[PDB]
Amino acid sequence: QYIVARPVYSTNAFEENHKKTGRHFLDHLKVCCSCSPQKAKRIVLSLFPIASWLPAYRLKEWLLSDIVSGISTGIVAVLQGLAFALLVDIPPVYGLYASFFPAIIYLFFGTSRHISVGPFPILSMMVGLAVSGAVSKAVPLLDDERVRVAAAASVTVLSGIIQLAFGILRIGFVVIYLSESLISGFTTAAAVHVLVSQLKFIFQLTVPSHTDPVSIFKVLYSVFSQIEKTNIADLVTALIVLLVVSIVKEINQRFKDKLPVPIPIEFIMTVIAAGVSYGCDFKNRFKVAVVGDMNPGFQPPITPDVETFQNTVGDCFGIAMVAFAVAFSVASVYSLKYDYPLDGNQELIALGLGNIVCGVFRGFAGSTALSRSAVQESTGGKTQIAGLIGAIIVLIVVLAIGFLLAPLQKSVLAALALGNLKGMLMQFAEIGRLWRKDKYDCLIWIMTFIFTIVLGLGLGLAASVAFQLLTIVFRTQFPKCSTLANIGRTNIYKNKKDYYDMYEPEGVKIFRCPSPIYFANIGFFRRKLIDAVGFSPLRILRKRNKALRKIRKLQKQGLLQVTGFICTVSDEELDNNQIEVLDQPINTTDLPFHIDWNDDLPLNIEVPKISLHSLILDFSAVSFLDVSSVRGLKSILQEFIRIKVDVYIVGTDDDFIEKLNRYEFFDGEVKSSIFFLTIHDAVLHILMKKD
Amino acid sequence: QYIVARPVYSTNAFEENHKKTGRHHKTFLDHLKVCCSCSPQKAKRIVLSLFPIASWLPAYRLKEWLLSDIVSGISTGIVAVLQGLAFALLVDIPPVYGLYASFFPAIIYLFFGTSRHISVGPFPILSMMVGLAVSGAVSKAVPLLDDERVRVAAAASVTVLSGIIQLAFGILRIGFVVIYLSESLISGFTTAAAVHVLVSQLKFIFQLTVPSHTDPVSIFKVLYSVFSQIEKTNIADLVTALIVLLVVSIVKEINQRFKDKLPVPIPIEFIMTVIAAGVSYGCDFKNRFKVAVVGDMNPGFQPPITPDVETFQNTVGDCFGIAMVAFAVAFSVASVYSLKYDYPLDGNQELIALGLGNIVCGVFRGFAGSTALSRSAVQESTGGKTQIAGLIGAIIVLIVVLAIGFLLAPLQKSVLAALALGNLKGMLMQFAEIGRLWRKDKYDCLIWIMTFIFTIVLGLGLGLAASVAFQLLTIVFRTQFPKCSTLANIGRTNIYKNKKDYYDMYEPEGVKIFRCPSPIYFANIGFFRRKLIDAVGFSPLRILRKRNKALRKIRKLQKQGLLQVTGFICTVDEELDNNQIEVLDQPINTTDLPFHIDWNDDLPLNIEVPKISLHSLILDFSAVSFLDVSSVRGLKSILQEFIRIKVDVYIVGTDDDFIEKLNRYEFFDGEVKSSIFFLTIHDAVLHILMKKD
Ligand SMILES: CC(C)CCC[C@@H](C)[C@H]1CC[C@H]2[C@@H]3CC=C4C[C@@H](OC(=O)CCC(=O)O)CC[C@]4(C)[C@H]3CC[C@]12C
Ligand SMILES: CC(C)CCC[C@@H](C)[C@H]1CC[C@H]2[C@@H]3CC=C4C[C@@H](OC(=O)CCC(=O)O)CC[C@]4(C)[C@H]3CC[C@]12C
Ligand SMILES: CC(C)CCC[C@@H](C)[C@H]1CC[C@H]2[C@@H]3CC=C4C[C@@H](OC(=O)CCC(=O)O)CC[C@]4(C)[C@H]3CC[C@]12C
Ligand SMILES: CC(C)CCC[C@@H](C)[C@H]1CC[C@H]2[C@@H]3CC=C4C[C@@H](OC(=O)CCC(=O)O)CC[C@]4(C)[C@H]3CC[C@]12C
Ligand SMILES: CC(C)CCC[C@@H](C)[C@H]1CC[C@H]2[C@@H]3CC=C4C[C@@H](OC(=O)CCC(=O)O)CC[C@]4(C)[C@H]3CC[C@]12C
Ligand SMILES: CC(C)CCC[C@@H](C)[C@H]1CC[C@H]2[C@@H]3CC=C4C[C@@H](OC(=O)CCC(=O)O)CC[C@]4(C)[C@H]3CC[C@]12C
Ligand SMILES: CC(C)CCC[C@@H](C)[C@H]1CC[C@H]2[C@@H]3CC=C4C[C@@H](OC(=O)CCC(=O)O)CC[C@]4(C)[C@H]3CC[C@]12C
Ligand SMILES: CC(C)CCC[C@@H](C)[C@H]1CC[C@H]2[C@@H]3CC=C4C[C@@H](OC(=O)CCC(=O)O)CC[C@]4(C)[C@H]3CC[C@]12C
Ligand SMILES: NC(=O)n1c(O)c(C(=O)c2cccs2)c2cc(Cl)ccc21
Ligand SMILES: NC(=O)n1c(O)c(C(=O)c2cccs2)c2cc(Cl)ccc21
């Protein structure tokens, strides 16, 4: 049974009954600049994770699986680079570049062993919007893709520079702020953006490159205004590949019995399309938009153009943050599995270096794609050597084998990108779940979706995270303040309007604020305390001071005798600039009596009656205070003590006491003897003091 | 003494021992029929609230209020006429329209306002916001006397849009916007606006010409445009500005200190404006010297103009900032005078009144404004008992506009700027707050510093928006890394404190209490998991995976026929590939084995499992105020694997509403049962002890 026989403490008889322990900028500087040989070796190994895991290789049990997974992820990466390379309005030659240099750099500089870094559609569309904005903001057939590619390379370089700076500054906790509901809404909006943007390729039309605000609907108009100019054969083949891909995806997620190495319809039907393209000559018999001739070889590096460095400096921050968040989220699952310690700052540094290399070598920025990582992990990728195999596959397909991939319809790629989107868009079935879950996460999801579909894929994210930060204030703007009273005549206190056996001590009003008290709700806390208490202490003090002034005036006139309050037998309204004297503390030392303003009072003088001798502010749920809240609480406690009703604060810990000490909050009036351990011992001390 | 003899409760034997109450109605779908319930008394109350004039006009004590109100009205009227055509220079418009901004808002607020101690008009912060907005409008508009006309038209339109926004906000009853403006941010923004005033009045204190600049870095651009042409200043105008500045400051401080035997505050402002006008008319500053005298005042008002739609679209961003700053300044100024004299000011009514006043002023060729701090202070100090003083100020402005314009025409237009700089002493004194805040919170000081920097660089509207965003981020900053600790008993009673704080620290065997002194939401669930794992001492998922691997190897050996079950009689490394490792996270079931192996005492040969020392843990959630979907999911996963590794989990310090909220989260199921919540830490520990033995 629950039996306690301890004395009553007041947070100031406690420290004097139990001794404390030691509580000890130059402190951190010395321990941060302490150079050591072992520390240098550790930091070098961390900055170069390759040396950490290359020696610890179990070849005879890892090599075959890694090779198979590497070939699979390489074929998927070559299929995906020149598909995501179309969301950016650049030739698909450079898409393969974006899937090789980041992989090679991440081999050396990365920690995760189950991600295949490359381009993914969300970042590809971010880069496309950024490059369109750059080309539109730049002061003055084959004359457009050149500047598009140059601007894309520069924007990728700047995104990589931002990522590298963030990694160097060791601010890797940025991925914390994005959360889960916001990432789900942003993911759904980006999926819708993919669906809208791929229409211009699924229909084989020409669309002007729109930028930033209302990007989807502008593209929607530019696509739907020219339906009569589509190509029927291209639409038919894209449709047929779409339905067959969906059907086999269903038949693959189902029938998962005796089906090793699930059938890769992506590559299979891209091969089928390339074959029928070389066979029946869609370019001659029909009019299609086949991928252009692939030049054999890389391209010389180009210096990052400075003119577009300044123009896009806004969108590159969003690109870098989205890339880092996607990479961290994708690698989080594969680090939770297989139990290895992924490092966020190291991941940021690796991704930044990869983006610098890719942008310098005429590619575009990217990070590990969800589907590519999934296929790499499922195929048996034991480490990043699978990423190396994918990189060398991309290298050989760039250098030698390009003519077989040249006759690709360039719209089957768009439909394939639209293909793996069912699980990408299934998150739409979450508004209903979140409506009955929190009623705030659903709001944040809806606002995120609206902002990312109206403001665009860019500034929409910033507005979404700003609204996310505002949502915390929304949650704590109006705390459900209540009144507490005893239950069962023991040390249990609950809400007054919740139980039938409620018992309240005489003249004691317990107030609890179940939310942190900061700047945005100190006024609401004061109003709720006012309502729960039932009167305004400032009003009571003002009326008492007015009555005392009238009494003193009568005594000076010579109508009241002090021994009492015997009377032998003019409302003086006060002007401005002098009413402030009514807020002064009540002192009656000049009067020999001890009038309490409770029993009675001399003639024709009225003072509101009082029924409170104490109140207890429960601060168990209060987690922090700021300057505004401290000032408001000090004023509240000040006139509460001034109207001669004691105040007590309970449920606070030693660090909270220490923080409140350095606030100029304690003085001769608001003493430090007001803090108590629990509610019950405060009530007990209250009863002992009263009688 | 503290004596308690209650039974041990578990938040589920408590509800079954004490009956609850009704709680029979919701607050979302049934909230109607009380808001749309039309009633006669409700209609009278709402009409009285929407027209506060009828509330306090009948309740007038003339014989004790009229003389004081008249005196305060004359004083505030002379100050308002002195201030309108002074703040009218911050906007690049003729100072004739400045008097308009101090008359129509006052007249409208007379009818529509709740506060009885504010004199609504133009104030420098909003005047500069309107100036920046109108400069942006004139710069973004597609195509001597030809410039101020479009400037005035665009200023009137931007004022109209600000008033429309304020009226819409008041109608929507969102008057709680003002509480997103923490005192630290408001102080930083006030100081930055003071610096902006000081810089922007230089072009008039020096009598130069400066191109109108807009938004990003608008102080340093004006600083360059001013400092590039020092040689073009007028020495006489500079000399009179400096002498007036020093004397006004000196006598203002004399008024501050020598208040004893000082009947009525010193009229220095008006007295010296009169002196300057007199000497200007006398020595002919325009002829003998070259000055920038206020131009001739045309007698009469101006016909109303339609609000230009072309500039409606361009400035729609800056007008939100203008409206919010105006409403915040009005509410903050009236807050002091409502705390005094104890009357119930209504924020929505104030918003509606200010919006209507701004609409009228903008339609009648004025510019937006709200009650100025100094004007309100002088109106209150002079004895303003109600808004009839505001009416007297308004009629004073009317008569000075209509009749006496030639008297005020020969004003140097630089003494006005110096007077504007003179009062800036108290406004700029707030710079002595970074030091106070650095030793107070170390976060409010950061808010102040970032607010000042953002308002200096980004401008006024964009600076305020970015400052508010950073202020909102500061909450996450405060709760990003909670100071999580470990709790243990003190004195063998129901007192639990931090483990690293006392010498008599007693911890129960095999019980680890964890407390998170901050709300657990999306931005610290990972940190909470890391801290909990570190305090516990092991990874529960790692322990589960190793136990499952050992059990799989044991089952393989038993199938091969090497281990006998009856007790674990024995005789004499299969790495798992991907897409199948997920079987290691399954719950441990040994029903197929007759024994009850616990993975503590020992284990068959050549099989290693990490030892364990925890049989329960108590998560203190007294300080946890709220959870979201992400935190609920993370907590559910954590409790899931903790229960799966066969160590009980208990949560204490939570209230009935928190239990109710957590119930509708899909958080309780056959594994994470509802019997895990306890009242306090001590009864949880006691139940732990009773269950163990
Ligand atoms: C959910 C809400 C509160 C978020 C904020 C929404 C605004 C930022 C959006 C909604 C309407 C949008 C506008 C709708 C229409 C257009 C027209 C568009 O003009 C053109 O493309 C050319 C038109 C022409 O040449 O006639 C430029 C963007 C703009 C102003 C949009 C800019 C972004 C706006 C203001
Ligand atoms: C706020 C959310 C919930 C609703 C979003 C609706 C609007 C913000 C969208 C829907 C249709 C959009 C419009 C569709 C077509 C046009 C025309 C389009 O092209 C031109 O004006 C170019 C000239 C020409 O086409 O001849 C420019 C964008 C605009 C105004 C779009 C602006 C934004 C609009 C109004
Ligand atoms: C806190 C995070 C968001 C980073 C810090 C703020 C950046 C967003 C700022 C700080 C430095 C700024 C740069 C400082 C100097 C310049 C040169 C400046 O040169 C011009 O071209 C001037 C003419 C013009 O662009 O109007 C253009 C803006 C730019 C690139 C600025 C772009 C915005 C930057 C990167
Ligand atoms: C806030 C911290 C954690 C990250 C810091 C990274 C960025 C804020 C830096 C890194 C690279 C910088 C850019 C590098 C190069 C330039 C080009 C520079 O333009 C010129 O030199 C123009 C010369 C001319 O016009 O003659 C303007 C600044 C800018 C955009 C810089 C702006 C600031 C950037 C984006
Ligand atoms: C505390 C920090 C993180 C806040 C963010 C700072 C930026 C938003 C500021 C800092 C530097 C500023 C820039 C400094 C210089 C200029 C040049 C200025 O160009 C001109 O006025 C014309 C110059 C010419 O004609 O040569 C335009 C604004 C701009 C780009 C400024 C835009 C706003 C910037 C990027
Ligand atoms: C971030 C904080 C802590 C420091 C703020 C410093 C800069 C943001 C300021 C200081 C000086 C400013 C510059 C001072 C002078 C100029 C020239 C000025 O005029 C022109 O370029 C017009 C052409 C001409 O004057 O001939 C435009 C603004 C600019 C670039 C200013 C841009 C903003 C600057 C770099
Ligand atoms: C969010 C809630 C609480 C407040 C709503 C207030 C504003 C968002 C509204 C009120 C007045 C509106 C403005 C009223 C008039 C116009 C002019 C209008 O322009 C035209 O009609 C152009 C016609 C043409 O070009 O032929 C464009 C919208 C705009 C700026 C409106 C934009 C939306 C405003 C600012
Ligand atoms: C939540 C708060 C901040 C108010 C709601 C968002 C507003 C900031 C949005 C919603 C409606 C928007 C307006 C809707 C329609 C138009 C017409 C549009 O017409 C054009 O001139 C198109 C060409 C162009 O400006 O690029 C200009 C923007 C404007 C005024 C928008 C300005 C921004 C507004 C007021
Ligand atoms: N697994 C696999 O091989 N693939 C995919 O998942 C594709 C997608 O649709 C993606 C959407 C978001 C990331 S990938 C895809 C597209 C092409 Cl062109 C070729 C192969 C592809
Ligand atoms: N009290 C008073 O009479 N005055 C002031 O405080 C003036 C200011 O400088 C203000 C700065 C911010 C609000 S007012 C002022 C200016 C003039 Cl032109 C005439 C009188 C004035």
Q: Indicate the proportion of strand residues of chain A.
A: 5-15%
Q: What molecules are bound to this protein?
A: cholesterol hemisuccinate, the ligand NC(=O)n1c(O)c(C(=O)c2cccs2)c2cc(Cl)ccc21
Outline type of chain A: elongated
- Total helix count of chain A? 29
Question: How many individual β-strands of chain A?
Answer: 10
The structure class of chain A reads: mainly alpha
- Assign a percent range to the helix content of chain A: 40-55%
Distance separating the two termini of chain A:
30 Å
**Whole-number total of structural domains of chain A:** 2
**Rg over C-alpha atoms of chain A, rounded to the nearest angstrom:** 36 Å
Biggest sheet architecture of chain A: 7 strands, mixed
The pair of chains with the biggest contact is: A-B, 99 and 99 residues
Oligomer: homodimer
Subcellular location (chain B): Apical cell membrane; Membrane; Cell membrane
GO cellular component, one term (chain B): sperm midpiece
InterPro entries (chain B): S04_transporter_CS, SLC26A/SulP_dom, SLC26A/SulP_fam, STAS_dom, STAS_dom_sf
Function (chain B): Mediates chloride-bicarbonate exchange with a chloride bicarbonate stoichiometry of 2:1 in the intestinal epithelia. Plays a role in the chloride and bicarbonate homeostasis during sperm epididymal maturation and capacitation.
